């Protein structure tokens, strides 16, 4: 219950499972998501994770009660923000496979991911503003970086949703599949990634994270140093050997 | 050149190089552009009507650096765009042979009435060329795909009647009644809710590339606008009062 | 398998599993792909012609993990794409029954000439399936919307003549003249400005999803290109000189 | 004359009104825009502003004479740059409702706004480069952030315009309506925003501004602290009460 | 051989010319590209550069051997990274005219440019990850800035290509022309730019570079100071004189 | 190869002496360009680990050639070569020590600021008198000084143009060593010799981390320090360094 965990080779599947609550991000759910990812970070048999919900909901926000019984004093000392920081710290390719609604926390959780594949009926939204609040988990930072000021501001300031198709044209998502195929296609995406050198994935992803953290020039230098790191790995040898003599590479993770 | 006559809400333009079969030269394109400026800006002109002088409608471009892009870019493209843009009903009275640019221009009118002996000659391919003036946009929509391809690839005559049977034009009449029936319809349309008509034309143009979902928003949008016009109010009261409506086109 | 013959600018491919009604197996798809490679790369072949051996054109996929995506993804999709991609005129001579993939493949030719006794059987729905090979792309454009829906949902025969009347194909001829007339047209097209023809086909393909505005830029673009070809120059001099033009297809 | 001011509930409408000059941004106009926004910033009866021009022009640049009679020395000490900084400092949702031409200063003024709704015939452009100048009001910074390097560079280096449709697909604008509806639809957009808690709008908008000012990690922390601020407000209570017991919330601005 | 150099007024054309190697970016090629651009930087008769390949390839990566015979120690001291830094330092409008494949280094070289015009059959891709490496020339920084996190991550982490059409909708490219026209249309683009004041181009481009280097507020100030610089130039006078009295301006580069 | 710049060597330490006595060691275009070529050549010489840069007892460098910056107009100033030489100096990837005796004014101060470490003579002076000429610092004087001595002292010197002694500069953190004039250079060479004793790659790694600290916020600096650190974990010399330390000897590094 709450979060189902499943496996397909070096791909780890995390299914938000709170149907009656529209997969709302529980404190308990969030913590279980954190425990699973932190465990996978160090499991050398895992290369990629996929997060999904169900056909009707990815995650329809967060528990509204858990957020009310927090006052000025209780909000300052809340545990949740560090949970989100630990989710972000996950060091392996993280794909969100979104069907149905991704709203508020649900949407902020898809923005957290490296890659979003959506279903034809997906909806993305930040309705925090309608409740007299606002996004408190990256909504106001991550959206605007991938879709630009006008759209992100409209979404954040009015709280109106957009379709999976608007989302892809805006850059919030990079795929749109028929609802019954999203999850399956998301997993295939994952299996293609998981076929590459694990360390390369990690260094490539770190390169990518850091682009949001620094100016371009420093980003280039940092990419150079993660590049040079790989030069020193065994799998770099394997990856291009297996490519030049035309086979499927077997990576040791070194 | 180009003869023009305005009467009773109707602006009638006559392609007028009769011996050349009203083929276009640079000077003719300029005069046409000038006349169109009036149609666009003068809002008592609530219907345009194109037709040819002599025995032909338009043999297209008079073919006497080889950069065919420029001709397209200077003459036919702004002409086609603005005609498509015009929020007024345009009727093409094809009174004879319509060839090259002449055919694709004629075929691009909102309502096309052709004389029985008129033929549409799109022989671009024979010259190793492509159908211009929206040719390749229009044919698939006016004739459907298999026929547009057939017409454009093999490149041979299409009679008024064939075109009709094929759905490419609205009407075919005996040569000697053409001028009359066309001018009949234009006078009629020139008293109809021009604003409403302009939205209809735009909506239908737009629907070619919109989804149903997008298109329902645009219809709501156009209805919302139409229902504030004077002519909407006039039309629902004339009908309720079993009297004949007097539209102003706003 | 697949018989192929090149003569006089014309590459004629014959689907050749006569008893199976030239239904496709994996080995047949490979040979077809190989022959197409030649059409694409060899530029003296300026017309392709598809036809069937025996009494049928193509009964489609021979139906003897249940992942129908792969078949589509391996065999029919690259075949359809590259045919659409081919800047050369393709003629489909449908000499008999065209079923499943066979019908939608046939219907996707630039110019389709069908024997009188030929029928198009798209019975996908009877199998709880969908029309493939561009089926669901083609039908609405070739037959219009109400008919594409009717054909695809109820899923029953369409005779050559019906298809014709409906605008889905270019010509219907007596069975015994089919081979002759098709091969007549292919020989003809194989001497026409192939480059020009290739742009025409691309333009018309593209116009299905372009606005008029986008499409006028693409026509300017294609005219600009066409008017630099050898065949443009040849075509305007042959005509001026009242002689018969000798196109090379460049 | 020059700028018409009008009101619709907590929505303030600002109409550039210099027809004969194509709504060109006068020094006087700019200053009037600044005075109006600075007045609205502190008017608790206002929640949102909309800026528009007419059907043919939003604003077709700035007075070309006022810019010529400025030499190296006069350009260094110009008043205008601070005017622009004061416009940017406006702390409430700012929607640009663009019809017709938004060029040079006009375009830079739409980029300044949080959200752009455009009409089907809108054109956006920076023709500064053709005059032997360049954008001096955010053109070279704001455009590239919402449409990316290739398009913004083309626009800035060649000075060619784009259509409202190109603009939306690029992210410069978030809506495209028939010309006769742009203004009306812009105002409805505004009225939806103005129905939300004013402080939430302000904190959400501040969150958004700051995303352009900092790296992601700091952006997240800053969003957390504007979040926590709202937790402490009265309207947060009202916003979610009115939502849970299904009514329209009445916010005190506290 | 290797790089063809050609000229059209103040437009300089650089043609990658290694057909048998799919225009792969040689060390020698890279250095020749660097020498040519550094020479054009100071040639006052040049205003714009265009880079292109052929119809089938723009550049299909880099020499795979030259990269293998580099070990941890040899990778640290590699010459190439500074070559890329010198290419980036080119101070004039740089347009990439891409036909066919732009992969790995080829793609990173198009991202380096200010503006990309692509052909209908162009493909963009970073397949570094499949070889057990990753992008080492700006791939992980520049892509994500113009197309956003989801798409850039998918491309970088899976190494799958995209079409010229996906590329334009994503913002990686700003034009898509029929293959046989890309180069010609790219050159016309260039000639429009090269008709403007050279110093304006340089200051406008510097403004643009710096947007990737700083936060918005500082970007605005810096744009102001490059603006003010132009105010002091002779061509500013010429540019607007020639515009107000309706002619073609003749710029002295002062 | 330039009379004005004496190139000399001590083991893995390279010494560059500014030598335009008549011109108070003013930084010429030619001198600047020479300096760039020397350090670039040293960047790839695997027998070099550290550089030291010095003038004489009376001057380190007293500004730049004043004529060369005058005959440049608004146009000539926009396209000047000099700024890219400064960036090429700063791109030198090995430890760079400035041994300053006497005047380091204008470009001279800017040069020293450009170095990773400054050791000064008791009589050394540091200042940026550009503002007195009606200009300003043009090579980092406005950027590097404030980063190491705070806003008050930096703005003072830059806005007013006044010098500060070697002792004021050590307290302010512009300099990290003050010695008797006759010992400055000698002690600066002992400092480079001590650095040059460590792993060439480690020196390069650690330096790069230090340069980036001025380029990115703190969190990103740490992330960056870690990828550089890890880099060294992959080197042979890391094994040699701690091996020779644990079994108590002098490490022989291969540069790998």
CB atoms inside a 10 Å sphere around CB D105: 29
Q: Which residues are within 8 A (CB) of C201 and not within 5 positions of it... i.e. 6 or more apart? A: B149, B153, C86, C87, C88, C89, C110
- The CATH number covering residue A223 comes to 1.10.12.10
Chains in touch with F (3+ beta-carbon pairs under 8 Å) read: A, D, E
Residue at which a domain ends, from D175, D196, D217 = D196
Q: Which residues are within 8 A (CB) of E61 and not within 5 positions of it... i.e. 6 or more apart? A: E22, E24, E25, E103, E104, E105, E106, E127
How many whole angstroms separate alpha carbon F101 and alpha carbon F184?
7
Whether residue A114 sits in one domain with residue A5: yes
The H or E element spanning position B19 is none
**What class is the C193-250 domain?**
mainly alpha
Whether residue F33 sits in one domain with residue F14: yes
> Is residue C217 classed as helix, strand or coil in its secondary structure?
helix
Disruptive mutation site among D175, D180, D184 for chain B (greatest number of B CBs within 10 Å): D180
Picking from D180, D208, D240, D232, the residue whose alpha carbon sits closest to that of residue D55 is D180
Q: How far is CA B144 from CA B26, B201, C135, C138, D195, in A?
A: 33, 19, 15, 10, 50
Question: Which residues are paired to C173 by β-bridges?
Answer: C115
A201 touches chain E (CB under 8 A): yes
CB atoms inside a 10 Å sphere around CB E34: 18
Using a 10 angstrom Cβ sphere, with 0-12 exposed, 13-18 middle and 19 or more buried, the burial of residue C89 is buried
Whether residue A251 sits in one domain with residue A168: no
- Cβ F91–E82 below 8 Å, yes or no? yes
The shortest C-alpha distance from F64 to chain E (Å) reads: 23
Q: How far is CA D25 from CA B231, D36, E83, in A?
A: 38, 15, 45
How many whole angstroms separate alpha carbon F108 and alpha carbon B46?
80
Whether residue F115 sits in one domain with residue F50: yes
Nearest to B137 among C112, C197, C212 (CB): C212
Domain coordinates of chain C in residue numbers?
Answer: 1-192, 193-250
Q: Which residues are within 8 A (CB) of E86 and not within 5 positions of it... i.e. 6 or more apart? A: E34, E37, E38
Count the alpha carbons within 13 Å of E211 in the hemisphere toward its beta carbon. 28
In this structure, what token pair is assigned to residue D113?
């706004």
Q: How far is CA F42 from CA B1, F5, F37, F48, F87, in A?
A: 79, 15, 8, 6, 16
Picking from B49, A5, B13, A231, the residue whose alpha carbon sits closest to that of residue A239 is A231
How many whole angstroms separate alpha carbon B150 and alpha carbon C164?
13
How many whole angstroms separate alpha carbon B86 and alpha carbon B78?
12
Strands E11-17 and E2-8: antiparallel
Whether residue F204 sits in one domain with residue F145: no
Picking from B248, B246, B224, B93, the residue whose alpha carbon sits closest to that of residue B171 is B93
Nearest to F223 among A210, A228, A232 (CB): A210
Experimental method, per PDB record: X-ray
Q: 3-state secondary structure string, chain E?
A: CEEEEEEECCEEEEEEECHHHCCCECHHHHHHHHHHHHHHHCCCCCCEEEEECCCCEEEECECHHHHHCCCHHHHHCCCHHHHHHHHHCCCCCEEEEECCEEECHHHHHHHHCCEEEEECCCEEECHHHHHCCCCCCCHHHHHHHHHCHHHHHHHHHHCCCEEHHHHHHHCCCCEEECCCCHHHHHHHHHHHHCCCCHHHHHHHHHHHHHHCCCCHHHHHHHHHHHHHHHHCCHHHHHHHHHHHCCCCCCCCCC
* CATH code linked to domain C1-192: 3.90.226.10
How many whole angstroms separate alpha carbon B187 and alpha carbon C34?
62
Q: What residues of B are in contact with residue D180 (Cβ under 8 Å)?
A: 225
Q: How many domains does chain D have?
A: 2
Nearest to A212 among D192, D216, D240 (CB): D216
Secondary structure percentages of chain C, helix, strand, coil, to 5 = 50, 15, 30
The length of chain E in residues reads 254
Contact, B50 vs B80, CB < 8 A? Answer: no
- Ramachandran angles phi, psi of F136, nearest 5°: -155, 175
Buried b / exposed e across C183-220, counting CB within 10 Å, b at 16+? bebbeebbbbbbbbbbbbbbbbbbbbebbbbebbbbbb
- Cβ E156–A200 below 8 Å, yes or no? no
Whether residue F217 sits in one domain with residue F100: no
Q: What residues of D are in contact with residue A112 (Cβ under 8 Å)?
A: none
Q: Which residues are within 8 A (CB) of E184 and not within 5 positions of it... i.e. 6 or more apart? A: none
Phi and psi based region of residue D102 (left: phi greater than 0; alpha: psi -120 to 50; beta: remaining): beta
- Ramachandran angles phi, psi of D25, nearest 5°: -70, 95
- Cβ B132–C218 below 8 Å, yes or no? no
Chains in touch with E (3+ beta-carbon pairs under 8 Å) read: A, C, D, F
How many whole angstroms separate alpha carbon A4 and alpha carbon F77?
66
Whether residue D204 sits in one domain with residue D180: no
Terminal Cα distance for chain B, rounded = 33
How many whole angstroms separate alpha carbon B230 and alpha carbon E25?
68
Contact, A41 vs A90, CB < 8 A? Answer: yes
Terminal Cα distance for chain E, rounded = 37
Residue at which a domain ends, from F149, F166, F198 = F198
Residue found under tokens 């550094």: E38
Whether residue E8 sits in one domain with residue E118: yes
- Cβ B145–C204 below 8 Å, yes or no? yes
Q: Which residues are within 8 A (CB) of E218 and not within 5 positions of it... i.e. 6 or more apart? A: none
Whether residue A85 sits in one domain with residue A2: yes
Buried b / exposed e across C221-238, counting CB within 10 Å, b at 16+? bbbbbbbbbebbebbbeb
Nearest to D204 among A64, A134, A145 (CB): A134
Q: What residues of E are in contact with residue F204 (Cβ under 8 Å)?
A: 76
Whether residue D216 sits in one domain with residue D124: no
Using a 10 angstrom Cβ sphere, with 0-12 exposed, 13-18 middle and 19 or more buried, the burial of residue A117 is buried
The length of chain C in residues reads 250
Q: How far is CA F147 from CA E221, F98, F151, F178, in A?
A: 20, 18, 8, 20
- Cβ F215–A217 below 8 Å, yes or no? yes
Resolution (A): 2.5
How many whole angstroms separate alpha carbon A208 and alpha carbon E153?
7
Strands (E) in chain F, as ranges, are: 5-10, 13-18, 50-54, 59-62, 96-100, 103-105, 117-121, 125-127, 164-165, 178-179
Q: How far is CA D234 from CA A66, D254, F114, in A?
A: 18, 5, 55
Whether residue F255 sits in one domain with residue F191: no
Whether residue A109 sits in one domain with residue A88: yes
Range of the domain at A174: 1-196
How many whole angstroms separate alpha carbon B85 and alpha carbon F107?
65
Disruptive mutation site among E96, E204, E209, E244 for chain D (greatest number of D CBs within 10 Å): E204
F228 touches chain E (CB under 8 A): no
Angle at A212 between CA D113 and CA A229, to 5 degrees: 160
How many whole angstroms separate alpha carbon F102 and alpha carbon F233?
42
Picking from E42, E13, E246, the residue whose alpha carbon sits closest to that of residue D130 is E246
Nearest CA in chain E to F76: E254
> Is residue B92 classed as helix, strand or coil in its secondary structure?
strand
In this structure, what token pair is assigned to residue D35?
């005075």
How many whole angstroms separate alpha carbon C22 and alpha carbon B38?
62
Using a 10 angstrom Cβ sphere, with 0-12 exposed, 13-18 middle and 19 or more buried, the burial of residue B242 is exposed
In this structure, what token pair is assigned to residue C244?
């018969």
Q: What residues of D are in contact with residue A140 (Cβ under 8 Å)?
A: 204, 207-208, 211, 219, 223
Q: How far is CA F77 from CA D53, E88, E199, F109, in A?
A: 42, 21, 12, 21
Dihedral Cα C117, C122, C127, C129, nearest 10 deg: 160
How many whole angstroms separate alpha carbon C117 and alpha carbon C231?
39
How many whole angstroms separate alpha carbon E77 and alpha carbon F207?
14
Picking from F91, F133, F128, F134, the residue whose alpha carbon sits closest to that of residue F107 is F128
Using a 10 angstrom Cβ sphere, with 0-12 exposed, 13-18 middle and 19 or more buried, the burial of residue E20 is exposed
Contact, F59 vs F112, CB < 8 A? Answer: no
Q: Which residues are within 8 A (CB) of D70 and not within 5 positions of it... i.e. 6 or more apart? A: D78, E231
- The CATH number covering residue F189 comes to 3.90.226.10
Strands B10-15 and D2-8: unpaired
Q: Would you tell me which residues 147-176 of chain B have a C-beta closer than 8 angstroms to some C-beta of chain C?
A: 147-150, 152-154, 166-167
Alpha helix positions (H), chain D: 27-41, 64-68, 72-76, 80-88, 105-112, 139-147, 149-158, 164-170, 182-193, 198-211, 216-231, 234-244
Residue found under tokens 């770099």: A236
How many whole angstroms separate alpha carbon B215 and alpha carbon D245?
36
E98 touches chain D (CB under 8 A): no
């Amino acid at each position: 219950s709450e979060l189902i965990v499943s496996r397909q080779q070096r791909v780890l599947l995390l299914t938000l499972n709170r149907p009656a609550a529209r997969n709302a991000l529980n404190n308990a759910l969030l913590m279980q998501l954190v425990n699973e990812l932190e465990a996978a970070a160090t499991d050398t048999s895992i290369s990629v994770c996929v997060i999904t919900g169900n056909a009707r909901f990815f995650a329809a926000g967060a528990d509204l009660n858990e957020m009310a019984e927090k006052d000025l004093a209780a909000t300052l000392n809340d545990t949740r923000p560090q949970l989100w920081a630990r989710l972000q710290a996950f060091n392996k390719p993280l794909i969100a496979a979104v069907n149905g609604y991704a709203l508020g926390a649900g949407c902020e959780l898809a923005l957290l991911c490296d890659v979003v594949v959506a279903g034809e009926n997906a909806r993305f939204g930040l309705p925090e503003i309608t409740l007299g609040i606002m996004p408190g988990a990256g909504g106001t930072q991550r959206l605007i970086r991938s879709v630009g000021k006008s759209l992100a501001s409209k979404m954040v300031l009015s709280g109106e949703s957009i379709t999976a198709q608007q989302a892809q044209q805006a850059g919030l998502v990079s795929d749109v599949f028929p609802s019954d195929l999203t999850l399956e296609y998301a997993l295939q995406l994952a299996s293609k990634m998981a076929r590459h050198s694990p360390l390369a994935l990690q260094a490539a992803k770190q390169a990518l994270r850091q682009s949001q953290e620094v100016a371009l020039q420093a980003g280039l230098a940092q990419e150079r140093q993660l590049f040079t790191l790989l030069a020193a790995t065994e799998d770099r040898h394997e990856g291009i050997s297996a490519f030049l003599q035309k086979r499927t590479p077997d990576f040791k993770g070194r | 050149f180009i003869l023009s006559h305005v009467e009773k809400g109707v602006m009638t333009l006559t392609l007028n190089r009769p011996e050349r079969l009203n083929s276009f030269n640079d000077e003719m394109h300029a005069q046409l552009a000038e006349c169109l400026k009036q149609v666009e800006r003068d809002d008592t002109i609530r219907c345009l009507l194109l037709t040819g002088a002599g025995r032909g409608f338009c043999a297209g471009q008079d073919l006497n650096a080889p950069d065919l892009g420029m001709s397209v870019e200077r003459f036919y493209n702004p002409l086609v765009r603005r005609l498509a843009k015009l929020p007024k009903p345009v009727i093409c009275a094809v009174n004879g042979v319509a060839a090259g640019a002449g055919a694709t221009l004629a075929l691009g009118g909102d309502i096309v009435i052709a004389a029985r002996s008129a033929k549409f000659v799109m022989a671009f391919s024979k010259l190793g060329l492509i159908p211009d003036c929206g040719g390749t946009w229009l044919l698939p929509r006016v004739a459907g795909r298999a026929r547009a391809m057939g017409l454009a690839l093999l490149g041979n005559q299409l009679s008024a009647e064939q075109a009709h049977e094929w759905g490419m034009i609205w009407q075919v009449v005996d040569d000697e009644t053409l001028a009359d029936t066309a001018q009949q319809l234009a006078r009629h349309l020139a008293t109809q809710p021009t604003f409403g008509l302009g939205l209809i034309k735009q909506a239908i143009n737009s629907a070619e590339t919109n989804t149903l979902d997008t298109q329902l928003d645009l219809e709501r949008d156009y209805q919302r606008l139409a229902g504030r016009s004077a002519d909407y109010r006039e039309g629902v009261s004339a009908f309720l009062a079993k009297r004949s409506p007097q539209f102003t086109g706003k």
